[PDB]
Amino acid sequence: LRRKQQLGKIYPEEVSSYTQINPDIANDLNLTFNAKLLWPVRGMTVGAGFFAFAHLFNLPYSFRLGLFVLPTAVELAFTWGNKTSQFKSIEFMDYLLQYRVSKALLEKNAKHFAEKKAAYQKEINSSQSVQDLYNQLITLVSEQAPS
């Protein structure tokens, strides 16, 4: 609740990025955050499969209803109560909080770094980050330098 209070609303665009680290993060968020109604699609289609077999070698409609409720109930049991999805969503919310904090600083200082950005991009053809390129320079000077 506190972590989600910090992040007022989570947008679908920002979710997909965390699929780089953990897929099915949208599934975890749905399992933990009451975004929508999790209709048991898998259980309903399994029960329909039982309904097809129960309609071939005819079983009573009582058995049809029971074997329709059973897989839906199984999916509901395996869906709700999943508290590991809550930990996955805690990790995602920490990641998204940090991403939003950093992105907020990007817009504040976008005006200031506009002049340097042009020269840096035009004379350094590399999509690698400065935080990553500089550490390569640090270790390169550490290993092979006149010292």
Partner: protein, 93 residues
């Protein structure tokens, strides 16, 4: 005591070469009826037993968690994430 002379004679002398074949339809009908009361009712009970501690005590099933620290990359308009591994604990109670 007891008078089980008939039953003792039955135990001593029984047919070793007598058998009756089973009707497979009725056999599988009985077995599937047993499975229906096994699966439904007893899986309700077994899932309650198995998942109640997993609902009211999740921290024991997720021992290790990750924590992120992000920094801007202004020139390329990127975000750089550093990760740390922590013990998933009861934070702030």
């Amino acid at each position: 005591m007891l008078d089980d002379t008939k039953y003792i004679q039955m135990a001593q002398k029984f047919p070793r070469n007598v058998s009756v074949q089973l009707n497979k339809k009725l056999f599988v009908t009985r077995t599937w009826f047993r499975n229906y009361y096994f699966v439904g009712v007893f899986g309700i009970f077994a899932y309650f037993i198995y998942n109640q501690p997993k609902i009211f005590a999740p921290f024991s099933g997720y021992p290790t968690t990750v924590a992120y620290k992000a920094q801007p990359d202004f020139l390329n308009d990127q975000v750089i994430f550093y990760s740390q591994q922590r013990q998933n604990t009861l934070k702030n109670f």
